[PDB]
Amino acid sequence: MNIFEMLRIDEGLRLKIYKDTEGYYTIGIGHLLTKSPSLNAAKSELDKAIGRNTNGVIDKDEAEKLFNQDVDAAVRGILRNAKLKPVYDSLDAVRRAALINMVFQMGETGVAGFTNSLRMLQQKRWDEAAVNLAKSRWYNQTPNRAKRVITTFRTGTWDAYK
Ligand SMILES: [Cl-]
Ligand SMILES: [Cl-]
């Protein structure tokens, strides 16, 4: 298992614009298009992102290309973030995947806001961090996905995904 396979399990793959769990216009592998309510603003962003007139639909390769950029952007965002970088540096390879996952889903800013949990992760207090991470809107909104990520942080194994 690796970060790509993990996020592909968590986000799925859709070749037509869809709305995410929060109601936003998305396409491919969790690629957020816009927070605007307009399908047109969504189609425009999509065409901008792909470099072609898509009429809201893309092929698998296009989906995967966006996905590669997003994972890359995620990792680089973590490494440029003064609050996140130290956490990441401290972690083993599996747990690093868990943090990248959170950042892909909720952006750097959002994760950077989990002050207490980040400190607990840094100190390698697994059980405590797992309990703290569960007291969040995130967990209440996407309980199944949150549980998988959290289990990954607690255990440091890919069990939740097997
Ligand atoms: Cl883009
Ligand atoms: Cl969920």
Swiss-Prot record:
Optimum pH is 7.3. It catalyses: Hydrolysis of (1->4)-beta-linkages between N-acetylmuramic acid and N-acetyl-D-glucosamine residues in a peptidoglycan and between N-acetyl-D-glucosamine residues in chitodextrins. Changing T26E: Complete loss of activity at neutral pH; covalently bound substrate. Keywords: Antimicrobial, Bacteriolytic enzyme, Cytolysis, Glycosidase, Host cell lysis by virus, Host cytoplasm, Hydrolase, Viral release from host cell. It is an enzyme of class 3 (hydrolase). It is found in: Host cytoplasm. GO terms for cellular component: host cell cytoplasm. Its main location: host cell. Substrate binds at L32, F104, S117, N132. Pfam families: Phage_lysozyme. Induction: Expressed late in the viral replication. One of its GO terms (molecular function) is lysozyme activity. Its EC number is 3.2.1.17. The active site is at E11 (proton donor/acceptor), D20 (proton donor/acceptor). One of its GO terms (biological process) is cell wall macromolecule catabolic process. HAMAP family: ENDOLYSIN_T4 (MF_04110). Endolysin with lysozyme activity that degrades host peptidoglycans and participates with the holin and spanin proteins in the sequential events which lead to the programmed host cell lysis releasing the mature viral particles. Once the holin has permeabilized the host cell membrane, the endolysin can reach the periplasm and break down the peptidoglycan layer. Belongs to the glycosyl hydrolase 24 family. PANTHER family: T4-TYPE LYSOZYME 1-RELATED (PTHR37406:SF1). This is Endolysin.
